[PDB]
Amino acid sequence: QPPKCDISGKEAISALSRAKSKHCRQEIGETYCRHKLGLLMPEKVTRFCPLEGKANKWDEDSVEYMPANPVRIAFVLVVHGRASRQLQRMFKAIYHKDHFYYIHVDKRSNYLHRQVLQVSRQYSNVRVTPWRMATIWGGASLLSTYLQSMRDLLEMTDWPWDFFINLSAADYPIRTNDQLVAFLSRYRDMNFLKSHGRDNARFIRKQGLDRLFLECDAHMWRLGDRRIPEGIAVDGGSDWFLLNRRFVEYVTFSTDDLVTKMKQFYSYTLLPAESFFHTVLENSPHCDTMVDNNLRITNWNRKLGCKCQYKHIVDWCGCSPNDFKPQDFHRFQQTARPTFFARKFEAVVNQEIIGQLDYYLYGNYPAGTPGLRSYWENVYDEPDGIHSLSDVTLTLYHSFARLGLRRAETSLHTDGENSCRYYPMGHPASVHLYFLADRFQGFLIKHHATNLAVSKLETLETWVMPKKVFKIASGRLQFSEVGTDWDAKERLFRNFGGLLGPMDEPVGMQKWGKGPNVTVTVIWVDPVNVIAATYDILIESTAEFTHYKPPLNLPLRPGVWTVKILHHWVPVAETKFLVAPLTFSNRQPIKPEEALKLHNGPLRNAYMEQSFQSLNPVLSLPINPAQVEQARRNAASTGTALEGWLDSLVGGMWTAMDICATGPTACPVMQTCSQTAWSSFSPDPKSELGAVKPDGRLR
Ligand SMILES: *[C@@H]1O[C@H](CO)[C@@H](O)[C@H](O)[C@H]1NC(C)=O
Ligand code: NA
Missing domain, CATH: 2.60.40.1930 (Macroglobulin (MG2) domain)
Incomplete structure (x- = not known):
């Protein structure tokens, strides 16, 4: 079907020619034609702040007192990917019984969602968002996620929270809960947002705020130019912040000219969470509550982090922060400004710095605690089905399991019946990556097989490791x-x-x-x-x-x-x-x-x-x-x-290093998986969540 208006803008034509679905093509055209008539975007907005400009409202010993009326914090965790055990470890660090945790899991990350559900079922102050968006990088949907979660949280009358804090699965605290609560209790009427601080017209062009975007088919399409509305100051910076309940209430329920028109403008904006809350706050009646500090350390490295790695996802080029390494530990002890969280951390990239930080904040685990230097990360789980694998990984995971079965047979020395001979059954049940001391150890494959001597099904896990092949001369x-x-x-x-x-x-x-x-x-x-x-x-x-x-x-x-x-x-x-x-x-x-x-x-x-x-x-x-x-x-x-x-x-x-049984086994030389040091079934107390302690903590 043809559009409702002649479409001549080069950007919109390029989008229509690349869009895969008919629905997305129709919405691209509908958005473009609305804008062409001047009926999509606001062009003048009322400013309610009585200040001429911005407001921009540290003794290390000030976070040591004990408050009589401590704040209760609502943490919104926006998470995606596979790193469930690291998320559990961070959750353990930030948990206290008087706070609240509301967890949004990306619609595309079903394994992680199943693991998060197990957490929310254990604790009364943990809930999961029943709605789930596919929050692509730079997508408009990230602001929709925050705004809906704020409305949800404000209507939970049984959760009397005073601050809203957003975190990802790659964040970690760098100060204790006691210090966070003491600091926020002293500044409970303030809002913590970090502005770019440089030239504002350049910020607008670099951010693409003067461009119209549309999110559709999990892609951010650029559709043309637009004017910045008159009458307001536009600002922005980091999309990680802490906002008090009063401002969140204003953002959610106000119908004044500013909030209404900004919600429309930022529905078609790239990286909206990097500037929506700054622009509303600065032009609102709450403008004098803004502190130009988001209490975060973000590990920017422009030489490595700005390689336009999201070109297939958004019609724009962007940057992302680097992962911390052990040589960065001293940066978590700086004294210039108050900071309570940092990012990014990835256990598959470097877990040593995560351990150093956690033990620094909350002390060593007791001697003899297992798994402290290990990391396990699930990369396939049966409920998601073999069609979520590729032909390549399905082929190789099958082959790894057979290599394990052959190891079991050759590990029994006997001249009678070999009770460690197996026949494989069905498809792999799960696969984990396994790391030790930041060295990749290989794959762990859980699989089913018939023990041929007793004619019974058994469930096993195999560890395979790649042979060294790099050789110098x-x-x-x-x-x-x-x-x-x-x-x-x-x-x-x-x-x-x-x-x-x-x-x-x-x-x-x-x-x-x-x-x-x-x-x-x-x-x-x-x-x-x-x-x-x-x-x-x-x-x-x-x-x-x-x-x-x-x-x-x-x-x-x-x-x-x-x-x-x-x-x-x-x-x-x-x-x-x-x-x-x-x-x-x-x-x-x-x-x-x-x-x-x-x-x-x-x-x-x-x-x-x-x-x-x-x-x-x-x-x-x-x-x-x-x-x-x-x-x-x-x-x-x-x-x-x-x-x-x-x-x-x-x-x-590849070498099959070992194989274990999850339950009973008729093979005399096979160990029980829970009793090994390497199995995904062995103890991993640093990522395990149990009963709440007298002090209200899990850590
Ligand atoms: C290094 O580069 C320079 C020019 O950049 C070249 O003249 C030289 O031969 C190269 N190798 C060495 C060992 O200098
Ligand atoms: Na719960």
Whole structure:
């Protein structure tokens, strides 16, 4: 169907041409045409503040007194992702029985929501939002989430709260609850918001406040220009704040000119929570309550955090803070200004700094407490279904489980019946990442299998760990790795296991120490010694990481690839990586014609237009005609033959470290999972939540 008005703006045309759903196209057009007539945005707004401008209203010993009328705090936790045990650890740190906790879990994070429900069922002062939005980065929906949660909280008459504080799963306190309550009790009529403080016209342009945006199909579309309304001062800064009940009441229930028109304006705004509350407060009757300090330390690093990493999500470029590391601990003790929270923290990136901070605030755990240096994070959970996995991860998780079953059989030494022989049943039940002392240890896979001696089903967990493959030879090179999903801000691969299939596009990374600039040669070698790519790269004196994604035609030949680094044909180092053949297509066993198309190498017979056959003799990489033919045979296989090819490849690159039983077992040499040090079933008291103590705490 055609639009209600001629659509000629280049930005709107670009959005309409990229939008996937008919609903989104119609809403894009409806929004554009409304604005074109001048009926969508306000252009003049009343200012109620009696001040000429802004108001901008520290002794370390002032947070040590004991208040007679302590504030009660409503924490709104806006969380997403997989890091449930870290969220539980932070919740333990900030919990007190006289506060309140209201938890919004991103609609797309169903595993995390199930874990949060278990928390809300234990404690009367914890509730979960029954509505759930998909709060994409920069989305307008983040303000809708805050405004709805404020209305909900104001109508819970059994929760008499005095302040509203927002936190994510990557936040952590840097002072005790006692000190937070003492400080807020002394300034209970103030509002804590941090402004950019620099040139305001530049802030408006950098933020895109003079641009019209629309959130639809989990994307933020830019649709054109708009005027800043006259009569008000527009301000902004951090979207992390603390607001008192009186101002939250005004924002929620006022119908005056300011609140009404700003709610309309910010419904079509990028990063609305970074400026909506500043602009309303400063122009409201409450303007003289504003303190230019959000009581947070935010770990900005412009060199690493501003790589326009959200381009596929919003029609704009943005920045995000870095994760703290152990060398940052001294920053949590600064004395310039009062601060009570900090971000960001990620246990999969660095857990040591989280431990240092928690023990600093609340003391060591007793000697003999297990799991303090470990971290477990669920990356697949059965209720979400195998269609939420990929064919690559479904194939490999199956193979890891079979590797565990083979370890159980070979671990029993006996000349009679082997009561540790198993037959696998069904699909993996769960998968965890496992870390120890900030070193990746591999995957834990929970699975079901029949013990063949007694003919009974058993539930097991297998630990698999990747074999070391980086090898140096007689420079500033420290490490080399191949992977996917490179995180330029944290400088690591978010595909932690390096799981790859024939249609993946691998990335080569190098890590360097200090020294003078140098140039090296990178060579990619496929499983039958076909040289797929060669290139030189400059390593500047100041470079720490380098990475590059060669344009290799697909599919890649399955097997063990090798990536070599040379310095003027002198060997430097090498690493290896596995392109796995897939046993599933659309989560069903792969058929002969599917496998042949997928497993016989690139459709162009060559990985790139330029050939490197003249290099094979130079590097002693002869192509064996027998191995080439065997790869053709392997490509046509399915079923049991294909399973044997896959498992021999996986076994060459992964080790089954151990396997345990969750319940009873007829295998005499298998340990109970809860009694191991490594299982996701073993004790982890730092993330466990129990009964409330006499002092009202869980920690
Ligand atoms: C480093 O770079 C400079 C120019 O930037 C170049 O002249 C020099 O040859 C390079 N290598 C060394 C060791 O200086
Ligand atoms: Na509850």
